[PDB]
């Protein structure tokens, strides 16, 4: 990944590539290739796969998503992410005269530095930042007096100069603004809050997924479920019934059933077929029956 | 895992342990430890973890679930599973006089052999089957004339004789029957059909999980969503609205909105706040707005 951002009174400009590389392998080989990629010895994508193949580790390049956003006519943002044990992020926000470098670990903002004036921020691996510096070190001081367009282009040249490297996609996005954001801190706090809501939603859906699957596993294949009291299936304290396969379904102790039966008869199931114990005549119901406990025969 | 099953006219008896061992590591080291475990050179659980630790591969033993079931007073079942690229299974069903060895790959029954008479079937790894054979080879011929209880016990001794090995849990379950199942083939077909329904449900829930999460990702942070036509928010062809965060939500093109506005006004969003373009006055709605496409800025 590579993000280059400029901020000044003339405006904010930010360019970013789209490359994300996933690794799937052992710890040592992950770390060995991880360093060799940023060491600068890896030339192009050919030697990446080929060396990764030698280390019996699969890598998956994905250039299909933008690292940079134009939040408004006043603000632009660029994000780099590094996922593993933890979900580490590095964002850079920018506007007319101001710039904010934010550091996120999981669901927390570790650091947030805001700056007023003129400057350039570059996010990426150690190799690209080293290389990008040596392009900017000369040309950077001409930025403050340039127009926006010329800076966008100046940055475009830097991406074209570097994109050959396999940590950078061959295509890139650039967004710019020349309006000042009055509530620059609030805008950033609100954009970040969305991330934490998304992670919350992700965890809430993940919990509800398992919660549904548990229920599916609790569906009674074979059991002695209840007795027909007063023309209705009274279920034992062990089993319960539910209307849908939902995460939080409605519980029922007494259930409506259709078939040939009387009061006092024992209701059973075998191989998913609900029948009368002794009669072996077929019985139907609109509701799904399950064990109350998630433990039947250990878990 | 270890399953030992007897079948005869005297009845069916089946014993099974509860041990499942998961591996998480590279392909070669998975295969290297995989063979060394079944080679017989691995003595106990101490040398398992210790050797697995040397190969930088984590193993997770779980003895918390039964491998054997008593489907009815006529049928008993015992299952061994081996999960990896594919989900390979080996079940053994048994009843009075009959026995069925079933082979499943994923959602298909590869083989199904049924037998009438007297016999013993053992499921497990190559080491245990070798060892179990050499216990049974002598004592097996006494089974056909024994009672059920004595066979259960005979099998209990075999488990106690072998459980020291780390591919076998120190506790085990045993179930037996002495009734003949009239529709032995149908019972098995119905028990298996449940597995395929469970895998179907698992895939349906997994699809719907993503289907909901896609929608959450399509929620509009910043967009020019529509225009107020005839006192109602007419949405463009690009955006749509939904009532809930559901997997299959109800779509809306025209939406009820509350606020200060008139006909012809453009409706926009920035930082999740819905407002009137030009006015910047706050506008509310009961429905969630999303991009129609799942592609906005690439995916």
């Amino acid at each position: 990944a590579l993000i280059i951002c400029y901020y000044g009174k003339n405006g904010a400009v930010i360019g970013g590539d789209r490359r994300q590389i996933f690794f799937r392998g052992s710890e040592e080989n992950r770390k060995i290739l991880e360093e060799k990629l940023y060491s600068g010895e890896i030339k192009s994508e050919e030697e990446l796969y080929k060396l990764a193949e030698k280390l019996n580790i699969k890598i998956i390049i994905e250039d299909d998503r933008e690292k940079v956003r134009k939040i408004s006519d006043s603000v632009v943002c660029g994000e780099v992410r590094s996922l593993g044990i933890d979900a580490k992020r590095r964002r850079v926000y920018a506007t007319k005269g101001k710039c904010a470098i934010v550091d996120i670990l999981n669901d927390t903002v570790t650091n947030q530095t805001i700056k007023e004036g003129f400057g350039i921020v570059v996010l990426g691996n150690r190799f690209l930042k080293k290389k990008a510096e040596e392009e900017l070190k000369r040309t950077a001081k001409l930025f403050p007096m340039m127009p926006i367009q010329q800076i966008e282009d100046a940055i475009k040249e830097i991406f074209e100069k570097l994109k050959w490297h396999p940590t950078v996609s061959k295509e890139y996005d650039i967004y710019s603004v020349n309006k000042y954001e009055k509530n620059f801190e609030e805008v950033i706090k609100k954009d970040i809050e969305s991330l934490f809501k998304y992670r919350e939603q992700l965890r809430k859906q993940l919990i509800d997924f398992g919660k549904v699957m548990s229920i599916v596993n609790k569906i009674v294949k074979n059991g002695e479920i209840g007795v027909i009291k007063d023309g209705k299936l009274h279920l034992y304290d062990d089993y319960i019934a539910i209307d849908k396969i939902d995460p939080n379904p409605k519980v029922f102790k007494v259930v409506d059933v259709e078939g040939n039966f009387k009061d006092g008869d024992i209701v059973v199931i075998e191989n998913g077929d609900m029948k009368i114990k002794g009669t072996n005549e077929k019985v139907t119901t609109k509701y799904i029956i399950i064990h109350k406990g998630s433990h039947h025969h250990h878990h | 895992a270890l399953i030992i099953c007897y079948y005869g006219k005297n009845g069916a008896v089946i014993g099974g342990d509860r041990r499942q061992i998961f591996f998480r590591g590279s392909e070669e080291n998975r295969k290297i430890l995989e063979e060394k475990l079944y080679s017989g050179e691995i003595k106990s659980e101490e040398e398992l973890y210790k050797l697995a630790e040397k190969l930088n591969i984590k193993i997770i033993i779980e003895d918390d679930r039964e491998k054997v079931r008593k489907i009815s007073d006529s049928v008993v079942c015992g299952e061994v599973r081996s999960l990896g690229i594919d989900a390979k299974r080996r079940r053994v069903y048994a009843t009075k006089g009959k026995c069925a060895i079933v082979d499943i790959l994923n959602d298909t029954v590869t083989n199904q052999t049924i037998k009438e008479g007297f016999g013993i079937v053992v499921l497990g790894n190559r080491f245990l089957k070798k060892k179990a054979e050499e216990e049974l080879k002598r004592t097996a011929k006494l089974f056909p004339m024994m009672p059920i209880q004595q066979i259960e016990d005979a099998i209990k001794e075999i488990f106690e004789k072998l459980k020291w090995h780390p591919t076998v849990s120190k506790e085990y379950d045993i179930y037996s029957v002495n009734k003949y199942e009239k529709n032995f083939e149908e019972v098995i077909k119905k028990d298996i059909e449940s597995l395929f329904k469970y895998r179907e449900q698992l895939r349906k829930q997994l699809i719907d999980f993503g289907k909901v999460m896609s929608i959450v990702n399509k929620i509009v942070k910043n967009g020019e969503i529509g225009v107020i036509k005839d006192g109602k928010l007419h949405l463009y062809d690009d955006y749509i609205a939904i009532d809930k965060i559901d997997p299959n939500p109800k779509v809306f093109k025209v939406v009820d909105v509350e606020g200060n506005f008139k006909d012809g006004d453009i409706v926009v969003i920035e930082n999740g706040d819905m407002k009137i373009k030009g006015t910047n006055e706050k506008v509310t709605t009961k429905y969630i707005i999303i991009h129609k496409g799942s592609h906005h800025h690439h995916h």
């Binding site: 000044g8 580490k88 350039i120 | -």
Partner: peptide, 26 residues
């Protein structure tokens, strides 16, 4: 165990943020 295993397995751009960002004040 499953949610645990994926974080132990997949690794997106590790070490890509192990160093400070490059800054220039103009």
């Amino acid at each position: 165990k499953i949610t645990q295993a994926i974080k132990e397995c997949l690794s997106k751009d590790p070490g890509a943020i192990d160093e400070d960002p490059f800054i220039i004040e103009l």
